Amino acid sequence: IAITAPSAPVPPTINVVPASPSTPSAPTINIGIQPPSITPLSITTPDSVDAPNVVSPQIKPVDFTVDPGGDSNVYSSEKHNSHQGWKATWDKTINVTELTNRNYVSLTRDVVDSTIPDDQVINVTKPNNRAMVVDEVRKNGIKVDFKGTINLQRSQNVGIDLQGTHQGSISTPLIANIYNSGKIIGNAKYGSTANKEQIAFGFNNADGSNNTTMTNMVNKGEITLNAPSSAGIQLKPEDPHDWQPGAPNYWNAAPLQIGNKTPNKIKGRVLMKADNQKDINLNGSGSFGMVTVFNEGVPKRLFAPSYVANYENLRSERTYDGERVLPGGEIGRSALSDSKYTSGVYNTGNININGDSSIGVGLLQEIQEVKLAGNINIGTKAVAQETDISNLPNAGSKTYDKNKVEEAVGVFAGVPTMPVKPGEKDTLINSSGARNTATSLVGTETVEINGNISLGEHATQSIGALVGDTEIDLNKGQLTENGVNKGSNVDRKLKRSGDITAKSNSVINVGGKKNYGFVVSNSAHSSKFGTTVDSLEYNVDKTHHGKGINEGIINIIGDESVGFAMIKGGNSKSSGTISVKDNAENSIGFYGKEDSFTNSGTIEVTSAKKKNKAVVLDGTNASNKINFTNTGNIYVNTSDNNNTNLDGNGNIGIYAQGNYKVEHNSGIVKAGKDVIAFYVKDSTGEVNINAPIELANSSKGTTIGIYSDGNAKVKFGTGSKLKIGEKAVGLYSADPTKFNNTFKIESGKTLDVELGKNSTFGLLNGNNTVTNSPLLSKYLNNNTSDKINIVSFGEGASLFYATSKAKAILDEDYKVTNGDAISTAVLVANNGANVEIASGKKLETNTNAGLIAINGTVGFTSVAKNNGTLISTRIDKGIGIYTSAANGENSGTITMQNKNAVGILGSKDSNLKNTGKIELEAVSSAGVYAEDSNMINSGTTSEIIVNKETSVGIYAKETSISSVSKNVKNEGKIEIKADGDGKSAGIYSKKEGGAKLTIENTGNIEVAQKASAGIYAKNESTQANTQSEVTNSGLVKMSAENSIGIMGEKSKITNTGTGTKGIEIVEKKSAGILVTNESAVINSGRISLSNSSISASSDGLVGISVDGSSTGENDASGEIKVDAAYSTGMLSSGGGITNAGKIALEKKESVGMYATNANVTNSGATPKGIFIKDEKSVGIYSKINSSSIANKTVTNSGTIDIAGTSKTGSAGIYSIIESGATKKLSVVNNGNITINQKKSVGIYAKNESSHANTESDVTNSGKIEVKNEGSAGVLAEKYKVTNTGSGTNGIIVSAKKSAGIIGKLGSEIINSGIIKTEIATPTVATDGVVGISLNNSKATNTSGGVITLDTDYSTGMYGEANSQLTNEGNITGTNKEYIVGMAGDSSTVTNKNIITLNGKKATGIFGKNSSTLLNETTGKITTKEEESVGMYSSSSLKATNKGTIITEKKTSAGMLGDKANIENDSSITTKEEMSAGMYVKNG
């Protein structure tokens, strides 16, 4: 009968206020690029010389004189012909015998001129004779024309001859003109006997004749000689000793005996002139056509043993009666100035030389004049060479040819010509020594030719014009050579050498094979006589004798023939052209070895043909100590200074091997154009250059003083003033494998060279044959002054030029402080070559560009490796190295100083390999730059560093040019130790094409300046986040707050990171993944930031942040790890957010999903979603402020979980609106949200003012798992709560002492759905459940929500501390006893709605603790179960009742007393059985 009631426990309150982080700002970016254009230089390619062996055949004596037998005793013109000249009638078969028998026809002392008609044929039967002799015919100008046929058969025979006369006068020399139209032939065989010394015409005499004798001969017939060593026309000076026959017998004795010598002033000085006016054909070998023999006197045949003892030969200077005749012989001086008294040699006809090793025209004694204007042909007639026909049996030596003529010579010079000078005193000498004079110059100074001298096609290494010596012995006489009198002792040799001059009228048409055009094989033997008899003085004189004076054209119609070839002799004066008439090959002009010959003339290649070389200067062949004392006139192939032609190419100035050097030390030297002075070979050749040079600007090609294939010991030294202007090149090379040792440079030998424009140190191709890379690190090496300094440049020039698979190394440091404009870059790699940058190299620059690489023919992979310190300091756009179709590699340090500087750049489908360290200490600069190519960072030593703001690291662009994917790879560490709050980035990606780009980082990236991040990409156009997507398997770390982690456009990311891999952020305000244009992420890996000391309020971070153009979402395997306090996983701004992975919360004051001005979505469910572990936090929380314009909300369709049997201090759903902000922030629940923690709240919203709460909205269309005791469903302060859950959705309150709905003062409590208590009956009394609880506030139950009570002793609404409770909603509860909905403790209660209940002894209202009730009748209670009462009073001094009670159920009562005694006066109808309104529990 003692009915009591329990008491509800006190509910908790929560105040969680998490952090308010912010979104960081992406930095601005982008830098331009400039490409350089290289200068289009020129090329030249020489080669070497094979074998210019100059074998010079020697001269041989031709002393083949016949005895002057005089008249005959059977046909004397006096006793048999009556002095009427030639007798017209004779026998056609006269058998002429030798001179001893005198069977020859003789004609002497005639007054009638006679000749021979055509019909004659005469042979010779014996040697040493004349078929017929026409002697002593002065006749003062005889003139006839011979027409008979003459034949030669034995040796020492004469075809026909007309000799001079002993009668004449000094002032009127004789004039002659003889014609000879006949045929003369000298054959090669006499049975089986050899034939030689057969002479056609000539001059010879034993006894003296008249000096004033002057004669002329005109050739008119056919001349043929087939005996080897024959003689066409012979000229001789007469003996000044004037040897005489055996007087008084004289010429009667047979053979002649020379019986006396009569030297005299006016004896032995005759004059002679010869002329060929027809065809001379020489078939014999080693012969003479027209030669001036040496005046040796006579062979010993006329020297009897009685007179061999007093054999005083012309082997000494000869003086008689006061004469001063030079040793060896002399032709007298002429003063009557006319060509008809000019005694010498001249020709107009033709000479046909075909015998092997023969002489065209020979000079053996000094004569008055030698000028030649005829046809000198050697080897132009094909003949089958045979023994004693045109060759001789070999003497164990060189074999003579059968079809070609070899060792043949044309002009032979062993002595010069000595004409009459204007001051010269003539030889017009009277008997008493009375002598005339001359007032002018007659004849040319030396050997002269004005006619065509030609070598035939059969000419093989034959000689055109030979300047040789003449080695003749001498008697016991005085000797003097370059010093004191020798007093004999040293051998006495007739040292004689001649000199030749030529004119363009004399075309030297040398032809055939390797023929020796004009070889000065002499020794320049210039000889003079002293003040006494037998006096001789010798020197190397370059004025008097033995020189080379060239003025004429030397026509090289054959191939690889040589002209002026130098074995010995010293100097010569060159002023005439030597040219190749055709496309002949390897023609060499100068084979020089000795004293400085002077080139006072041009020597070039005036033809399209090339590969023929100019001058070979090497060690002296036949004189001591390589006499290259070259300081004379050196004027070759240049554009000025005594040589104004530069035509052709392949011209050389120096060619040498072995013992050679150059010694230019005085005067002036002028270098050629498109010609190279130096080119040498082998491995031991040294060069000395110390003379200052003068240069003119280079030609269409390129000019350089020095070149070699890389194999010379060329040296530089101070003193040689060097200069360049306008498109020349300092160092030229086509073969760098050996070039490394070419130029040794010694300290202090700094060379001063100044340059114009379009120039370059290194021109290199390598000929695709670079076996060895030249270690070129010496020319401006930093160690010592063993450098070369060529600094004076204009603008538009380069340093090194690499083509054709060449290779070279930057020396050390070199700079060109002469312009940063176009065509001024350090070096260019062309045709796909490779160059190496050694470590420690310091090619600093201020110019336009550094290294440029471009591929032509591939050959070898286009790549250059950097190991040195490469820095640029150009004022604007200083680019370090560039590659096109070429791979860039570095392993050293690269920095930069000035603005807009650029490091390594690649393009055109290549890759970039980084191994070195790059630091960005400058501004407005990018280290590695790329476009339409690949790249990679190789190894952790590949270090990318930034030291200042306004600079970016990796830069790669893509386009529509190639639609194949590229890649951006990193294996090194990118630690950015920069400054400033931003303005710096590490890796940057661009695209405009239709392809896709792969970007992955496996190495490390770090940033130490604020507001900066490494990854950032351009993927703006219409595509998903998988084309320029960035995936990470590397490490993303940081060192400065306010910064950013992941940045970019349209990318998909995974956290492939374990250990020291992934993303690590330990400081403030540095978001992990901020995204633009819809980027997604896989969060399976390390997001362990370890920030804010996980318990300290010192930092604040965000895992992933999003913008309006993006929706941030996590992979289903995503593991978003809260390793920091006051941090966040999801930051949302404008765009959308959705979770598909796992989102935990391990640290304090964090949030998985935080949203600003954006909507919140969850799809991750079963078993995905949000799983909160730590406390003082909420899984998802979004807030907006007065400044927030976006009307956004929060949605739930996933799993949000936090649980705890001892954890508390948190809430399920959180969202705040700041006071005064009418922005309508709301939350909707439709997912799973477990609240199994202690004292938590499913949905929380905080208020700051009593404003109109229509903006804040709280609806629960989903489910809340209230299974943990003591917690609360939802709390709010002056906000609107709508219980929109129905059935298993919404208010699932299933815990003991737990609370469904509680509100603060003036809270808008609304019920519009299910309100179902815990189904489980309490395990102990008073352990019921409460739905509504109040504390000095107001609550509004609404009938729109159904309130269901199933826990025993549970309550629907609860109130305390003067709380005013308003009831308007439905009340339901069944299957349990008591379960009073209304329990009150010290409060004012008003009832408005009618209450219904089920269960035994169910009661609607229960009052406790001095509580009082107004007792409104409308708040009545409907009784459904038996023994149920409506009112309950317990421990209440105040009680008011003014209404009747209607009972309609059995055992049901009205008023009920509890442990008290109060009496009143009221009556209530008890019409039903046992249904009365009153009963008492106390007696």
Residue numbers in the entry: 290 to 1772
Can you list sentences taken from the study reporting this PDB entry?
A pivotal pathogenic factor, the autotransporter adhesin Fap2, facilitates association to cancer and immune cells via the receptors Gal-GalNAc and TIGIT, respectively, leading to deactivation of immune cells. Fap2 is a type Va autotransporter OM protein and with about 400 kDa the largest single protein in Fn35. Structural analysis of the Fap2-ECD by cryogenic electron microscopy (cryo-EM) in combination with AlphaFold2 structure prediction reveals a 47 nm long rod-shaped β-helix with a matchstick-like tip that interacts with the immune cell receptor TIGIT and the CRC cell receptor Gal-GalNAc at two different sites. Thereby, Fap2 simultaneously acts as a molecular spear that deactivates NK cells via TIGIT interaction and as a molecular grappling hook that anchors the bacteria to the tumor.
Cryo-EM and SPA of the Fap2-ECD at an overall resolution of 4.7 Å revealed a total length of ~45 nm and width of 4.5 nm for the ECD. The β-helix domain is separated into two parts of 26 and 19 nm, respectively, by a kink of ~101° in the overall reconstruction. The 26 nm long, membrane-distal part has a thickening by 1.2 nm, which we term matchstick region. To improve the low local resolution in this region by eliminating heterogeneity through the variable kink angle, we carried out signal subtraction of the shorter β-helix part and local refinement of the tip of the longer, remaining part to 4.4 Å resolution. With this, we identified a hook-like structure with two triangular extensions. These shapes in the cryo-EM density fit the lateral extensions at the membrane-distal tip of the β-helix in the AlphaFold model (residues K525–K836), and thus allowed rigid-body fitting of the predicted β-helical structure of the membrane-distal part (residues 290–1772) into the cryo-EM density. Although the final map-to-model FSC value was limited to 6.5 Å, likely because of the non-separability of the β-strands in the β-helix, the data together with the model allowed interpretation of several unique key features of the structure. The map and the model reveal a unique hydrophobic longitudinal groove in the V-shaped β-helix that winds around the longitudinal axis of Fap2. This groove is closed by the unstructured proline-rich, and amphiphilic N-terminus (residues N195–S361), which together result in a hydrophilic surface. The triangular extensions at the matchstick region result in two pits at the tip, which are present only in Fap2, but not in RadD and are probably involved in receptor binding.
